[PDB]
Symmetry: none
Subunit: 376 residues, 4 copies
């Protein structure tokens, strides 16, 4: 006898489903020392989340979205890795905790089709204005929580004021010390609402410009006034605030040349170079072994010390720019080392900013233009 909490188009939101999410938030809230608003408000947000997951889920069904066990495993695997364990290592923990593995996979699957559908649809909707990318192209990390008071695409004065009033009021209590994460859980409409509205740390530059402005002067602990956007009013709380170029001429010992046979050549090669008799690049193209530098006058392009054998790296260490080393023995053999020199995003940036916005906007529409009933 699993009651229905709400009907959502071609389906329902089960009383059980509501409980699970409720408990998830409850525990996670506790295991983090976070105040939760009264179970009344809480249920509401949970519902809103469930109803939405339902809508975008059915959507996935219609447009035939399937997730192969092969991909599923990879996902679970990632959750395992994201949590310091191997698939078995996590599968057991789950077993130990009492969970039926398939039941779990099935949950991760639902999460995956929703993630997919949301991404795919927002894609088929994001809009790129003429010359926008080329325009952006041509032209102190922060940690903050976020609260969104939703507003339709083309709202009414009435709607805008309700929203603004609501937002202002929240900004008030925010400043009078009220628990911001509590408020987020109670009024934020963004994805992160249930999670205290935490965005985490990020570059002030990866944030929409509509915020970049106010967060430049932003001091730790500050509440950034209700910023208006296409999705509604935003409220943020400022929670917290050598390579080397070298070239070497190499000699590798084998059958004919012994370690001394070779070292003696390198002594001569070194002697003729310094005397001007021949040049280093010439000598290298004439003697060096390592193809991939040998005919390149011995050049080894730029690189990092580490990729070099321990004997070699240590050689560079005692060399002066332009200086030539004495012969050096390494795992590869004997070689003359000459030290030359020693030197010590934005588009994805845009894409992600455009995506969050659009995704909000989308769900905004979906939730509105959807058949949903809430039973008692």
């Amino acid at each position: 006898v699993d009651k229905v909490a709400a009907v959502v188009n071609n389906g329902v939101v089960l009383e059980s489903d509501v409980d699970g999410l409720m408990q998830s938030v409850k525990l996670n809230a506790a295991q983090a020392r976070q105040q939760l608003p009264d179970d009344a408000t809480l249920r509401h947000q949970i519902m809103e989340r469930l109803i939405m997951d339902q809508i975008i889920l059915q959507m996935g069904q219609k447009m035939g979205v399937k997730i192969s066990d092969e991909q599923l495993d990879q996902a679970i695997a990632n959750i395992a890795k994201q949590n310091n364990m191997t698939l078995d290592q996590m599968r057991s923990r789950l077993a130990y905790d009492g969970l039926n593995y398939n039941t779990y996979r099935n949950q991760i699957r639902k999460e995956m089709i929703i993630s997919e559908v949301r991404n795919n649809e927002v894609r088929r909707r994001i809009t790129i204005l003429p010359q926008e990318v080329e325009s952006l192209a041509q032209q102190t990390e922060l940690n903050l929580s976020h609260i969104l008071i939703p507003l339709p695409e083309n709202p009414t004065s009435d709607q805008v004021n309700e929203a603004e009033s609501q937002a202002r009021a929240i900004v008030d209590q925010a400043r009078n010390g009220a628990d911001f994460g509590k408020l987020a859980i109670a009024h934020s409409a963004d994805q992160q609402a249930l999670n205290g509205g935490q965005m985490g740390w990020g570059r002030i530059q990866e944030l929409p410009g509509i915020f970049a402005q106010a967060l430049s002067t932003a001091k730790k602990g500050d509440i950034v006034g209700p910023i208006r956007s296409g999705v509604g009013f935003h409220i943020l709380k400022v929670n917290d605030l050598t390579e080397v170029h070298a070239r070497h001429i190499l000699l590798k010992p084998s059958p004919i040349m012994t370690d001394e046979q070779a070292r003696v050549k390198l002594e001569q090669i070194a002697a003729d170079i310094k005397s001007g008799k021949t040049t280093f690049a010439a000598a290298a193209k004439e003697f060096s072994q390592d193809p991939g530098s040998a005919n390149q006058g011995g050049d080894l392009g730029w690189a990092t010390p580490d990729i070099f054998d321990p004997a070699f790296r240590d050689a560079l260490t005692r060399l002066n720019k332009g200086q030539m080393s004495a012969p050096v023995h390494s795992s590869f053999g004997w070689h003359l080392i000459e030290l030359l020199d020693t030197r010590n995003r934005a588009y994805r940036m845009l894409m992600n900013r455009k995506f969050s916005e659009e995704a909000a906007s989308w769900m905004q529409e979906q939730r509105a233009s959807a058949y949903v009933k809430i039973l008692s």
Copy 2:
């Protein structure tokens, strides 16, 4: 340290500029589920576009082309409208996206002067044959992508064959199911190349005749063989293939003396005398109707659309037979007799645009050739 990708006459093509276009195509490609050729091919195409944008842009400089802020704003405005927003509504989105408004306008400016110079020059070049217009004058929507294999005005057999060969090969892969939009990005030389070579929907009649022939039998999904034109070889892919009334009324408007009944009773008589032949409708109208602008015109209301008429009136016409007179009708304007009389239900620009595209190709074809360009490595 912004390297130079190429030198173009009195100027250069910056490495940055190349990245911007690269990223533009990349995003737009993704946001549209469109395969892109390897970054090598892609850079080439982007280069060709940039080098050209450069040439025709310096050109604009010399012949002193300026775009007043007033026009600019109108342009941006149109882009906003073309995208469902108000100037502010777009200005903010840009802000939100992180763009410096001026840097943006300046981009829109460069696009504008280029658009202008190209148009103007092509104008100063298009050629109208004697009696062509008068000749054309006397004599199934379709969606298709386009790929152009360029060829000089007076090319050599060697050139023509290289071109034909290349075109043939593409048409092959096209029919073996290869992604046409991908090929367009990789080898098309038309303006639309970078955009999959999409032309969109259009009348088969608004296309050059050199194609009208093959696109008549064209079934959806077809690749139309390498058509030869003065600009080179063309390849098209058929992507997809898909009342008023005349009436007259004699009107009476109630006020002080004539009440709604005072009025309706008159119209009963006016109607009764018309049908009995005692007076004619047009006469009755000139003798009683109110609405000047039909009253002295024997009540004629000229031709019009039902909608411009009050709800009561329009509904009246609805139940009236042609030639039939209505009974008195009350409307927002008053009381009136309604008689329903009757009920009725490009090519030169066509030519101009066909001649323009061709000419614009030929133009740039020449400019790119007779221009000093260096491609740094």
Copy 3:
């Protein structure tokens, strides 16, 4: 459902045809950055043009004028050449633009019978007044200009002449207050060039009627030449551009003589040379004259019988060696033996010098006036009905 715009004698002027001409002017206008008067005034001009083309065309019918496909091709071919293309190369451009080749040929045809009829009729009516030609034969800076004609009948009335004179004056006024002359031309000119800005192009001041030549001598660039009165009405010219008169042709000729001594199996080069040196010193030392030694040793008939006279010629016609010595000589001076491709000779440079239209200009002027009144008359007497 192609309505009739106007009735013309035994034919009509279709609305379709009026659109065609309207569009041709429209495009061409744009393709040239040319202001056009309002479609009302334009339609009028287009009509007049079509009405006339109609008249003169039925005329071709009656007097049976036919254009063979052979000559038509030649004409189309000329348009092609005039436009930098081959018959095929244009035939294709046409195909690309969407036109039916036959439909096009037919248009070129109509254009051709009209041109023929007009020329034939005009020439026929050209008259030569008594003593006119002799009287001319007695008598003693390229320019580009647009033209506007305000029409007037052969024998007009004071009223007509005044309306014309008044309308013309008003145009010269606006012309000088900077109005677009080409716009005015398309709006009022009655000449053939009207619909084309009234452009005549570049031309010698001489190739123009004398009633113009007068004012066009003081004419500064940009000027508007007052309404000149002719038998055809009032004329107005705008001095578009004004350039220099292309230099003539300075072909320089030389008068020379020579005594030719081509060597042979008998006389060697040293023999054919030394012989000269002597045959020369005798000329200088009065022992004998050059022309004497010419008709005496010169091995060039056509020359030797003329005393060695080569007549007047352009130096390039001679052998290079000959031409050369010829360059390093003073008038009357003699050269040493000069070896060329025909033998050896002594060259004396004697001297140096540098080196219908009036009647064609007259007849052209005549054809000009005639053509104008002819149409003036044809149009005037024709049965024309413009449908409102």
Copy 4:
């Protein structure tokens, strides 16, 4: 640098002037579809023409011949009328063609003194043989071109043979289809030579008698054999041949009338009835009409002539009168007829038709021969020198 083509007495013939004439014939020739002989033969004729015009022109100088601007204008005006234009209308055509008006007038002037001198001199030399005119008094239009192979007044057998030979040759080519006009321009010596030798339409009667003979049997297209005159040998081609426009059939009537114009004394009813009686008396022998005429006719010039109005064309009469006149049989009498002059009785006596030079023709023929030998002599006795280039 206008060379002299030929010297003529006290003057010359400039190369320019030769070009002018060459060009005039050239244009006119084209504007008429007329073959011209080679420029060589043509130059000759042009020369001969210029030389003659020169001679007769200096002659005009000596005997002081001047043409007033007044008469010149009249002439030019006539060229304008002859050409469907007004003086102004032509003066402009000239301006448009590029000519200097004065230079033009001067050409017309030179043409006029030549015309005068020639006429004056010729008339002076016309002679009338004893009994010639009396002897004359006792005794189908045609269009033809003419060619004259000249001969002196008293030529020699040699001259006459050369002439006869040359003429015969031309009549031959003429008949073998050769262009007659071409021949004319190439050999004719008459004034019309340079103009294809065209004389135009004319009565066979207005021509010299030595032609009238052969031109009576002449069929269109014919070449009339070389006729010998005192001026040389003539040859005519019968260009076209049309009908002779009918004469003029005017009709006259002979009538009598007795005039009774009413007045303050006699009213119309009185002036009418009076007649009715004065008429019945004529019919009933009581009296004769001519009697009642010289008796009551109020029209002297008629009443004294018995009422005879003599022969007159009907239209000369009052309409009423002319009308009764129409409804009358010969010898018949009318009832009283009221007109604008009064009342009268009209008797139509008779009707007849009447239709509508000889010496003018004679004198013209004369002027014709004289003008020919006159030039023949002038040229012959003149100081002429034709230069090569």
